[PDB]
Design a protein around this motif. Structure first.
Motif, mmCIF file in Angstrom:
data_model
loop_
_atom_site.group_PDB
_atom_site.id
_atom_site.type_symbol
_atom_site.label_atom_id
_atom_site.label_comp_id
_atom_site.label_asym_id
_atom_site.label_seq_id
_atom_site.Cartn_x
_atom_site.Cartn_y
_atom_site.Cartn_z
ATOM 1 N N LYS A 160 115.510 4.204 29.246
ATOM 2 C CA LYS A 160 115.949 3.100 28.417
ATOM 3 C C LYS A 160 117.423 2.991 28.750
ATOM 4 C CE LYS A 160 112.974 3.992 24.343
ATOM 5 N NZ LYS A 160 113.139 5.506 24.250
ATOM 6 N N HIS A 219 106.966 1.503 36.770
ATOM 7 C CA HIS A 219 106.895 0.319 37.599
ATOM 8 C C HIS A 219 105.432 0.034 37.850
ATOM 9 C CE1 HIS A 219 107.216 -2.995 40.153
ATOM 10 N NE2 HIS A 219 107.159 -2.350 41.304
ATOM 11 N N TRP A 246 113.412 -2.717 42.077
ATOM 12 C CA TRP A 246 112.883 -1.388 42.337
ATOM 13 C C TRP A 246 113.066 -0.836 43.750
ATOM 14 C CZ3 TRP A 246 111.800 0.791 37.711
ATOM 15 C CH2 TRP A 246 111.479 -0.050 36.652
ATOM 16 N N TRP A 306 108.993 4.298 28.121
ATOM 17 C CA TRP A 306 109.719 4.242 29.373
ATOM 18 C C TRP A 306 109.015 3.338 30.341
ATOM 19 C CZ3 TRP A 306 111.734 9.637 31.223
ATOM 20 C CH2 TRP A 306 112.849 9.973 30.446
ATOM 21 N N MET A 307 109.770 2.393 30.891
ATOM 22 C CA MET A 307 109.264 1.416 31.836
ATOM 23 C C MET A 307 108.736 2.054 33.083
ATOM 24 S SD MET A 307 108.678 -1.567 32.488
ATOM 25 C CE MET A 307 109.750 -2.422 31.324
ATOM 26 N N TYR A 323 120.989 3.143 33.446
ATOM 27 C CA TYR A 323 119.560 3.336 33.494
ATOM 28 C C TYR A 323 119.348 4.476 34.462
ATOM 29 C CZ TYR A 323 118.897 -1.099 31.217
ATOM 30 O OH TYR A 323 118.893 -2.062 30.241
ATOM 31 N N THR A 341 114.695 -5.777 32.880
ATOM 32 C CA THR A 341 113.480 -6.529 32.685
ATOM 33 C C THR A 341 112.431 -5.967 33.610
ATOM 34 O OG1 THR A 341 114.229 -8.673 31.802
ATOM 35 C CG2 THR A 341 112.571 -8.729 33.607
ATOM 36 N N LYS A 342 111.165 -6.186 33.278
ATOM 37 C CA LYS A 342 110.048 -5.701 34.074
ATOM 38 C C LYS A 342 110.221 -6.005 35.557
ATOM 39 C CE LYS A 342 106.126 -6.400 31.562
ATOM 40 N NZ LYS A 342 105.286 -7.199 30.613
ATOM 41 N N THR A 343 110.957 -7.070 35.838
ATOM 42 C CA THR A 343 111.245 -7.443 37.204
ATOM 43 C C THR A 343 112.699 -7.225 37.552
ATOM 44 O OG1 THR A 343 111.525 -9.721 36.435
ATOM 45 C CG2 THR A 343 109.529 -9.194 37.690
ATOM 46 N N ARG A 358 111.592 4.129 34.718
ATOM 47 C CA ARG A 358 112.924 3.771 34.283
ATOM 48 C C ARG A 358 113.159 4.072 32.820
ATOM 49 N NH1 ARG A 358 113.854 -0.560 32.378
ATOM 50 N NH2 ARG A 358 112.823 -2.167 33.654
ATOM 51 N N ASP A 395 121.991 -4.487 27.745
ATOM 52 C CA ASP A 395 120.654 -4.269 28.314
ATOM 53 C C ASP A 395 120.226 -5.008 29.592
ATOM 54 O OD1 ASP A 395 117.806 -3.023 28.158
ATOM 55 O OD2 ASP A 395 118.870 -2.266 26.417
#
Length: 169
Positions: free
Chosen positions: A54, A19, A108, A16-17, A149, A102-104, A52, A99
């Motif tokens: 999936k 931040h 957020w 799980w992403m 998400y 992305t990390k960015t 976040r 999907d």
């Protein structure tokens, strides 16, 4: 019918992403055996910790229901907590056809992310493993795109998110 893991379905590494990596973190609650997440950065100024999920394939369905379990250590229970200490966490959702996260990407902030509700412990606990657990269910409307998400946001307390389960009637 379930869309995101009953619980154990996490089958090693939830992936799980987070931040700020400094926020949440996966803790092996092998008990059944399960992956959980937790933050407890009190004594650290300005906290905005995100998590976040999936991409959850909406599978038809129009009004999803989020069921979540979680322990929340009271700010008054903590020895020298600052005034900053919070004990509620925020849940947000975000729709997309494929999907693209992305990390960015999905920013957020509460903008691209639409806020379901602010969550607090409700006096109705249960044991587990062997800590007390809170369950609490929220649900969001429309949701028409292909999937979504989910994100939990801390900003000042200790609290383990024991398990999240997304489903619909």
């Amino acid at each position: 019918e379930e869309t995101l893991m009953d619980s154990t379905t996490a089958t090693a590494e939830l992936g799980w992403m987070v931040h700020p990596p400094s926020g949440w973190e996966e803790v092996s609650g092998y008990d059944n055996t399960i992956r959980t997440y937790q933050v407890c950065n009190v004594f650290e100024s300005s906290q905005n910790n995100w998590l976040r999920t999936k991409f959850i394939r909406r599978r038809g369905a129009h009004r999803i229901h989020v069921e979540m379990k979680f322990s929340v250590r009271d700010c008054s229970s903590i020895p020298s907590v600052p005034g900053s200490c919070k004990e509620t966490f925020n849940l947000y959702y975000y729709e997309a056809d494929f999907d693209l996260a992305t990390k960015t990407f999905p920013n957020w902030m509460e903008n691209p992310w639409v806020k379901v509700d602010t969550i607090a412990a409700d006096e109705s606990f249960s044991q587990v493993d062997v800590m007390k657990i809170n369950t609490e269910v929220r649900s969001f409307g429309p949701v028409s795109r292909n999937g979504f998400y989910l994100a939990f946001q801390d900003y000042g307390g200790c609290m383990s998110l024991i398990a999240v389960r997304v489903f619909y009637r």
